[PDB]
Amino acid sequence: MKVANYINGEFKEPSTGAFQVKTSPVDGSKIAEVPRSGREDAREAIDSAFEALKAWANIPAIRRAEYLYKMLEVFRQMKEDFMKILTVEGGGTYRKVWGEVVFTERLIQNAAELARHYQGRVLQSDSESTISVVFKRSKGVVGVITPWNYPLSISMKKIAHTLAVGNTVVYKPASDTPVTGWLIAQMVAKAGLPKGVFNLVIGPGPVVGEEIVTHKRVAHVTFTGESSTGREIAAKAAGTLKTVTLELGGSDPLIILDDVDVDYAARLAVFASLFHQGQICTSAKRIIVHKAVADKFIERYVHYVKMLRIDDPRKDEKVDLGPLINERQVALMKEFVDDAVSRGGRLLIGGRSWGNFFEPAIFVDVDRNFRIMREEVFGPVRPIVVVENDDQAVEVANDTDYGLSGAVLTNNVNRAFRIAEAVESGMFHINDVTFLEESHVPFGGIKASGVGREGGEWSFHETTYDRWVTVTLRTRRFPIPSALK
Amino acid sequence: MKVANYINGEFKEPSTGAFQVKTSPVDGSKIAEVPRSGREDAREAIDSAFEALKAWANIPAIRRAEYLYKMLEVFRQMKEDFMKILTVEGGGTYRKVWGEVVFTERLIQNAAELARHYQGRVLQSDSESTISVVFKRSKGVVGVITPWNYPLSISMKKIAHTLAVGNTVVYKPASDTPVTGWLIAQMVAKAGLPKGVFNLVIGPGPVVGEEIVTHKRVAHVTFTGESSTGREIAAKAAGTLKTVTLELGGSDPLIILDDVDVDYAARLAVFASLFHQGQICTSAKRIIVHKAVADKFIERYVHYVKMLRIDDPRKDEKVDLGPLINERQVALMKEFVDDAVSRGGRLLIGGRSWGNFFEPAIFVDVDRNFRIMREEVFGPVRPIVVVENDDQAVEVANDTDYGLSGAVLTNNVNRAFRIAEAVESGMFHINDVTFLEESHVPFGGIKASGVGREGGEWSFHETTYDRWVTVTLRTRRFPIPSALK
Amino acid sequence: VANYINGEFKEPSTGAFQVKTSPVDGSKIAEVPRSGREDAREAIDSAFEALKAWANIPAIRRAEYLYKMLEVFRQMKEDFMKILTVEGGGTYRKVWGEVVFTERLIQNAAELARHYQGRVLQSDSESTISVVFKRSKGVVGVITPWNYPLSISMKKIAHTLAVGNTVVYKPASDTPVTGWLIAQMVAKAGLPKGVFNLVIGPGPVVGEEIVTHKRVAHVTFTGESSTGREIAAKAAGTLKTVTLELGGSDPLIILDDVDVDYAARLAVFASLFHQGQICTSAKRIIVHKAVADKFIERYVHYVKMLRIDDPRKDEKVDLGPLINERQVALMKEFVDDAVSRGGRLLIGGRSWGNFFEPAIFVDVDRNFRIMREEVFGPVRPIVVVENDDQAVEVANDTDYGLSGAVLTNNVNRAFRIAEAVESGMFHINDVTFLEESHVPFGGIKASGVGREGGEWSFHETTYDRWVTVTLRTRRFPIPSAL
Amino acid sequence: MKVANYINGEFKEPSTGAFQVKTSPVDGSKIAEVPRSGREDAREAIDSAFEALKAWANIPAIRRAEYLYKMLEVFRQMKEDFMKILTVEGGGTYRKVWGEVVFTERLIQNAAELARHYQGRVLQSDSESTISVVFKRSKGVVGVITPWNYPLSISMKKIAHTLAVGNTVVYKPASDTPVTGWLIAQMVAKAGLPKGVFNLVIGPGPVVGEEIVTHKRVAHVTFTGESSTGREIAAKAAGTLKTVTLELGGSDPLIILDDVDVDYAARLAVFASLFHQGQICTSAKRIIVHKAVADKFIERYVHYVKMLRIDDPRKDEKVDLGPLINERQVALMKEFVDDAVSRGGRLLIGGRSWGNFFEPAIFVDVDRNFRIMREEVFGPVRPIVVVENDDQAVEVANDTDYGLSGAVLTNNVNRAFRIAEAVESGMFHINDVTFLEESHVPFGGIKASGVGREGGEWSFHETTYDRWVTVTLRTRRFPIPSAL
Ligand SMILES: NC(=O)c1ccc[n+]([C@@H]2O[C@H](COP(=O)([O-])OP(=O)(O)OC[C@H]3O[C@@H](n4cnc5c(N)ncnc54)[C@H](OP(=O)(O)O)[C@@H]3O)[C@@H](O)[C@H]2O)c1
Ligand SMILES: NC(=O)c1ccc[n+]([C@@H]2O[C@H](COP(=O)([O-])OP(=O)(O)OC[C@H]3O[C@@H](n4cnc5c(N)ncnc54)[C@H](OP(=O)(O)O)[C@@H]3O)[C@@H](O)[C@H]2O)c1
């Protein structure tokens, strides 16, 4: 299957001539031949975006909204194609790629809905005869760099909202999910957006991504990926004084208190910690349980983990877990497991690997020095930690460099609110999963989980700037030269 | 006179023992002996602010207001001391420092007024039985790094607004204006803020400023200075994934169309372009004139420059201009004049310098390769360009790396608005000077002039983060394990 | 044509019918209900019962129904146009614009439903959480006029539904088939029973029941100011709130530094579109002495180009008839009054059937009826003034205060004049009846209270609810013996 | 001691020449001669206000803020004066009036704080080359009409906030608390406001108030009072199409679930339901408790009600309750106890009354047909209703014509929110008193409890209107005449 870049309105081959084969994580089957673009495909894309910017930003918002609704109609027609690819290229189960596609629809609609309603401000002026307002203005051409785990929805949240509010987009997907990127481009072009407004360039982050980050005609970069990558991207962005949105790692706590429906808490816990093989930035990566319910909770959780069906996600719709994205991740997960075992940890079930599939590894009796407590474990290896009181629940919760999401299960209004207040995270949920997400809410972290927020108006904040503009209606006397009446 | 750091409730001498001497830009006379602090002194300041943070952030906003209102009382009583020191250390005329002092009063008050009123949002949930809201949380320890040209007001806008909304502060004033910084510390202390909440550290930027910028326990740095400096700071800040506010340089365009009162235009142009010796970020640094009034305008502009009185800013109230801040700035103005003469620009007046003083130098017949058209000219050298039409005015206006402020002079509504939305600046003013500033408007630039906004709630946006928080009120079925209903 | 109650088209309990005839030629169009208080009471009761389920589904689900409704409207475009002309007397271009705008209104309501936000506050109390929600008011009365019965009905209806209220709708008696077509659309869109209700009856009966009923929480009204005062007074009884979009007598002010031809072309469209039957019509034209002669000359030149004919005949017809013969008689009274007081009729004034030519007057004074009253028809005065101050004085010399506009290229004159004119809406270098789907539409003085369009429609039909949570116990000041 | 009107910067006697004597609710001793004004007086004030409007509305907000900040200065100096009038004129205890006075300080500061920050909007335009903004404009002269139970704080929340955003004011206090209003005017005048910006007129509501409500040059009326009076005012206001704010009665429910600390619940309940003798719109007027703790709660509640100390509020700072505002109120309360006894209610305590003092009468075993369940009991009579579950609790809670505030005590987050969402009120409070109030939050009710919101920006919403303004920058073509 032949996949190209999308630049300035047309599908074209990389300037470098170089291609690469994308393989399925399921069985290593060849899916598509895809570009390995170089710095100049990037430059061509960026310049294409820059030229298209003036018209795009200056048409009325309602017109951009129409194009997005057009985008939404095409997408609805392309739903199966997207699912099919998210499953086979990305390793997602039916149910996983169903939710991603449903949410993506809601993401695109949301960007459209909001385009006409992003308001500036009329201000009171401290001077007489002065009108003092604030406009919203497009930043310009915006780079969009994304990960492989939820590559469709994460990309569209960035891309659609960026487009809505008058920016042009240069977009480079994760190299592990380039076909999904190509389907996006397909969708954009069947919607008929003007040449240059949206651009796809497939290639390596350190090369294509970096050129995007360091280019002078790029006003802003929005990025989702690892926290180390984020730090380098911020560093490089400083060169041209462009702004950034960094949606980085997470190691989110799921705290269970003792006044819960223990069974329910275990069902929820299993879902939050292990959906998409724990391949989720807002995954319940670290589980924190109250002593009084720990034993029953651990029995039930393991009971339910054991029931998880692992299989070729192409077989049927009821498969619970697919494989990890690549062989490298399986290796990292067996490291995480080994370190725990070696450190005197107790393995309750799983931890085997066959192919790119990894059987969920659940640990108890850990301390703060385990790799699975100090690093983001982006896969199906989870520590359970037992604590004696709420104050201890919060210390374990916050004992991380990360600060993305988090959650607490309880029926006590005070305990819920106190624990919410004390956990150091960008997002928090009382009595739900850690990876709750709506289209228009402010998604983002603190500490090492990143900087800024995305979703609806918050996405608009990121890709626009405030502009103070005034009009003075009465002439005034000026203080210099003091020799004037 | 002897000046000290203010750290953790207490005035103290540098860990390093080292003391520098601060002399007057007016005559070289010794003003005061000031610290030359080290990286050690910065860390002590930072940790103090960290330990004071929790208690300071968690009281109700109305307490924080009461302390700010308290600062306002104290500041009102010191006014003349701030005035004295701005003139004798910064070189500002009476009128200049009077204005800085009045605005600083409004700044302290604006931040106090708004503390209780910085709101979050209650959201419509896409999910049944879900409460979905967004809180405002303070960032934490905020580093405040300021320049020498308007050291009182630029500092206070940052310190007051940052404090109000629940952050703590480590402040490093410009090395050329350390006494102003110390006088601020006096104020804060006289107002009895809790120890550690506010901290002063007088020292070299590349060692004291850098420690602030790279420290772990600092969440945000708000910077005002050169753009080169900004790029540095933004890059080191990336190390700890902290956020920044960069208020960098400007080369703001003053466009004068042909339907104006030409004499008024001149009077405004002079004040805008040359006030405080043109050492103002939002100075009218590049004056752009319609050909139909160019001869008259230039005649008039030069006429009023001639009238500018340059003297000791301590002599009397009616002194138009004082010295530049040091020898280095004079040298720099000399290069600027050299280059422009070297390139065939017609020098109409000024150029004379003695000690730190400098008579304003006006040029015509320039082109876009002149250093005074490509760089920020942070002093009293000013180019005037004649253009033939509105397009041309705009093309020239946007021909710069900077995008801070800007202004157009006309009585025609279409011409004013079409020029306004065509010039690329963070701010813009119609029929007023380029450096309008009210205490609660979004102040800031685009392109190379920086990132973010400061003033009122915009200051608040910079030093807070949004936190999405939810409560789910009905239990749900989860997709895995699919076997289970 | 029938009512729509609790998900059913049904006959009026009174069994009475009345014939709708066409303003264009007097020919019968449809037999429509002539409902009474009982029919209003049933409708009200349906909406009240449907209320709790409809208010409490997520916004995204109400948005879905509206998008569904939007798709149905698109299918019915040519049906809505044909009625707006045959029933309402609108030209092709007039009804097309009404329909396009209605499309955008329906969409706007859907787009905004999910985005109507409350606030989170700083508490002056420690350990206290303090927030504000948005809640539906409940059952909402929607009472409308005949001049733009589609777009006016839908701005109210669509926006009111989106944000969780139920609706009892009552259209003007001169345009009920349009009201009925609306009921059609909602039914084909599949909204839950009771959520939307149509009752076609007389104002002082059906409308008054709606206004005075206990279970109605809010009434949104568009019509004459006298009715607005009736309605507001009767509404007081049950402490329900109202939105009153009332009459206009909008000034169009023309300064001396304008392109006079352009100014004239604009003037004709603003003052005369839909036979002047626009609340935001340029109803009083105000010109600066320095250009008054050429302006009047050009204005007249373009008015005599206007084509008044059967709006059914083709698409380039400029003007149709007035809605009925009372309106023609009243227009005669305005013209007759103006002539009697010594005013100069520049052009026009012929009538026939319900048709009525533009009548243009100059040399008038403030005592002319066409300067004191709303002239909801094609009779228009031009007033010459010597300077800006006088234009403003003349512009403000009215009980009304809906919209208004000034034509000029001088930024100061434009803005100072804007500050000074007393209206809810104002437009610089554009027509007086400027209208977008999401802007705060409404007036001051005698033109009403409140605002419709977008979030403002939501403001009208929601209330703010302050809710708190205290997380620490405290001591209390009584009994002091503790 | 003699009191005057305040019109156009001048303290003047009424046009009628007629005066009246304000006695104390506490012992009946004479307090002041106060005016009985007439329509001519209201008319003069309305005109003064009108004349004063243009200057006041046009100056920049910061200037209005400075005048307010100086009002704050004055009020701070007059604190003890306001306190002692709030007691001798209105019968508040030391603690009640202290709180009203602290809160009033806050309200005035809050008004000043916000004056410069009330923003309009910049809209996206569906047309090309169009600028589209929304301005905030002040309505004009504003009538302010207020009750007697919290005459300082309620008056001042309206007055200051209305003033802050550029309106002018014609203020008429309750005839039972006219001296408080006079002091307000004393304070305005000492702050040096432009003449006619603030006006005080003391007289009967049906004459002075009705004039304010019906006058063509009055733009808006913000009213606090009985719901019935609200209905009258709203009707009369329709004549000139002026807008109103109606802060009417309440009958708030306090719901106590069975998972609480019962003793604390009782302690809270006594404060919420009986503070200022129950003379609070947001008083906990109908108490609703779960069966599993009802016995224990009722005993405890009665225990602390019995401990209450009723006395001359002037004696000292520890008096829990003073008297009702007048003999009429005692009479009404007696009816309420009378009706409850005849309908089969069980009187657990209280009922003794001498002069204007009244001991809190507490009832159980009541039903929905009792007057004290169907009406606002603006005094110290309170029913306690036992329910079997959270459904019944909501059912009883919403069985009113009212819907001002309301509250629930419970440690269960699910029950707490479900209940709050279900109760029909303009304001709700989880685990605090029904009458929580801050300076800047939207205060107001639904149903019979009124229309609109007061407090900070919400006060500003009520006394301003939005103004859509556009600038079009490209000429365009028009559809008539089509021949072109
Ligand atoms: N906060 C959130 O919302 C969120 C959501 C999902 C996932 N995540 C995070 O995403 C991470 C896993 O994704 P990942 O393996 O794809 O992370 P990654 O290795 O950092 O890659 C992210 C993207 O950055 C590109 N990239 C790499 N180096 C670059 C450079 N020097 N300059 C510019 N771009 C560069 C990559 O392109 P290449 O393919 O060429 O490497 C990729 O498209 C996890 O840490 C997870 O927490 C965060
Ligand atoms: N956007 C605005 O609002 C605004 C307003 C006024 C001025 N400005 C700009 O400010 C500039 C003039 O002031 P300036 O010459 O003082 O600017 P600067 O040379 O860049 O230095 C300003 C501050 O940054 C500190 N600094 C220098 N190097 C640093 C480092 N590596 N790390 C941390 N801090 C460091 C300086 O310390 P030392 O003093 O010890 O070197 C000083 O406190 C001009 O560019 C002017 O346009 C901007």
Side-chain angles (χ1 to χ4, degrees), chain D residues 1-2 20-21 23-34 85 88-89 179 314:
Chain D
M1 161 177 150
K2 195 192 219 49
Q20 204 152 351
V21 174
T23 45
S24 169
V26 181
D27 51 21
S29 55
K30 317 197 180 183
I31 295 202
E33 291 190 282
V34 320
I85 294 306
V88 65
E89 159 175 85
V179 178
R314 303 167 296 176

Side-chain angles (χ1 to χ4, degrees), chain A residues 146 148-149 172 174-175 204-205 223 225-226 229 247-248 281 376 443:
Chain A
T146 59
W148 49 264
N149 71 326
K172 181 224 147 315
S175 293
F223 167 77
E226 289 170 17
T229 320
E247 300 268 350
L248 313 176
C281 68
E376 171 175 33
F443 196 100

Side-chain angles (χ1 to χ4, degrees), chain A residues 124-126 231 318 320 420-421 425 428-430 432 438 440 453 458 466-468 470 472 482, chain B residues 124-125 137 318 320 420 423 426 428-430 432 438 440 453 458 466-468 470 472 476 482 485:
Chain A
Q124 220 79 47
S125 185
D126 286 325
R231 276 183 284 256
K318 303 248 257 182
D320 289 320
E421 200 292 319
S425 65
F428 196 88
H429 312 287
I430 296 177
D432 217 315
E438 305 185 10
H440 60 319
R453 299 294 180 268
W458 282 270
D466 281 14
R467 192 199 193 192
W468 182 40
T470 67
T472 301
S482 52
Chain B
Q124 221 80 20
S125 184
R137 306 273 307 224
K318 314 248 157 242
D320 289 328
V423 168
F428 201 86
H429 313 295
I430 293 175
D432 218 310
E438 307 190 12
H440 59 318
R453 295 299 180 264
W458 281 273
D466 282 19
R467 193 172 189 229
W468 183 41
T470 62
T472 302
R476 6 179 317 198
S482 56
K485 271 68 182 181

Side-chain angles (χ1 to χ4, degrees), chain C residues 408-451:
Chain C
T408 180
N409 290 322
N410 184 287
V411 66
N412 300 273
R413 298 175 74 187
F415 282 48
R416 298 191 214 121
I417 283 176
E419 274 170 342
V421 179
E422 286 170 332
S423 64
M425 290 169 311
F426 203 87
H427 310 305
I428 292 163
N429 288 328
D430 210 317
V431 293
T432 55
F433 51 60
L434 209 64
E435 199 189 1
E436 311 199 353
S437 63
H438 63 315
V439 308
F441 192 97
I444 64 175
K445 297 158 87 174
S447 294
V449 308
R451 301 292 178 260

Side-chain angles (χ1 to χ4, degrees), chain B residues 145-149 154 172-175 203-206 209-210 213 223-226 229 232-233 247-250 281 376 378 404 443:
Chain B
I145 302 174
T146 63
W148 55 263
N149 68 323
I154 292 182
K172 194 210 86 53
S175 281
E210 175 166 314
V213 171
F223 173 81
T224 292
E226 289 153 34
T229 315
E232 247 292 302
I233 298 209
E247 303 260 10
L248 310 179
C281 53
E376 172 177 41
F378 206 69
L404 190 52
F443 192 104

Side-chain angles (χ1 to χ4, degrees), chain A residues 95 106 121 123-127 130 132 134 137 227 230-231 234-235 238-243 246 248 264 267-271 274-276 303-305 307-309 317-321 417 419-433 436-444 446-451 453 457-458 465-473 475-476 478-484, chain B residues 54 58 95 106 121 123-127 130 132 134 137 227 230-231 234-235 238-241 243 246 248 264 267-268 270-271 274-276 304 307-309 317-321 417 419-420 422-433 435-443 446-453 458 461 465-473 475-485:
Chain A
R95 176 49 181 88
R106 293 176 182 185
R121 245 55 161 196
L123 305 176
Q124 220 79 47
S125 185
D126 286 325
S127 324
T130 303
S132 186
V134 190
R137 303 210 78 189
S227 188
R231 276 183 284 256
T240 38
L241 293 169
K242 60 156 72 63
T243 51
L246 314 166
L248 313 176
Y264 179 76
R267 287 189 204 179
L268 189 153
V270 160
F271 179 49
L274 294 182
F275 202 60
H276 203 44
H303 174 59
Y304 288 126
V305 170
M307 296 188 59
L308 289 181
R309 179 172 154 225
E317 305 178 350
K318 303 248 257 182
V319 174
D320 289 320
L321 297 167
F417 282 52
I419 280 176
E421 200 292 319
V423 175
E424 302 165 342
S425 65
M427 299 169 288
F428 196 88
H429 312 287
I430 296 177
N431 292 330
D432 217 315
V433 295
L436 218 56
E437 185 175 17
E438 305 185 10
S439 57
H440 60 319
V441 302
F443 196 100
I446 65 176
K447 295 160 66 173
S449 292
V451 61
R453 299 294 180 268
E457 275 171 346
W458 282 270
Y465 67 81
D466 281 14
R467 192 199 193 192
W468 182 40
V469 174
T470 67
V471 175
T472 301
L473 313 167
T475 54
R476 45 202 211 76
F478 304 110
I480 72 181
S482 52
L484 269 70
Chain B
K54 178 177 261 286
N58 286 317
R95 175 49 181 85
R106 316 216 163 149
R121 301 295 198 254
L123 303 177
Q124 221 80 20
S125 184
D126 279 336
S127 272
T130 302
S132 172
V134 194
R137 306 273 307 224
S227 307
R231 295 189 254 266
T240 55
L241 287 168
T243 57
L246 304 185
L248 310 179
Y264 183 59
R267 290 182 185 204
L268 189 156
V270 168
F271 168 61
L274 288 182
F275 187 71
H276 195 51
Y304 294 118
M307 305 198 52
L308 287 173
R309 166 182 183 211
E317 302 179 11
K318 314 248 157 242
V319 176
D320 289 328
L321 309 164
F417 282 24
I419 284 178
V423 168
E424 300 182 290
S425 60
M427 303 158 304
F428 201 86
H429 313 295
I430 293 175
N431 289 332
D432 218 310
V433 309
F435 50 60
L436 266 196
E437 196 183 1
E438 307 190 12
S439 53
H440 59 318
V441 294
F443 192 104
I446 63 179
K447 293 156 91 159
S449 280
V451 312
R453 295 299 180 264
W458 281 273
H461 298 322
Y465 65 88
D466 282 19
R467 193 172 189 229
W468 183 41
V469 175
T470 62
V471 172
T472 302
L473 299 175
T475 56
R476 6 179 317 198
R477 202 217 163 226
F478 304 115
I480 65 182
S482 56
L484 187 133
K485 271 68 182 181

Side-chain angles (χ1 to χ4, degrees), chain C residues 123 316 430 456 465 474 480, chain D residues 318 420 425 438 472 476 482:
Chain C
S123 177
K316 307 215 92 206
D430 210 317
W456 285 270
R465 211 213 183 178
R474 75 194 206 253
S480 45
Chain D
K318 293 231 169 188
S425 68
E438 313 196 11
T472 301
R476 67 187 216 241
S482 68

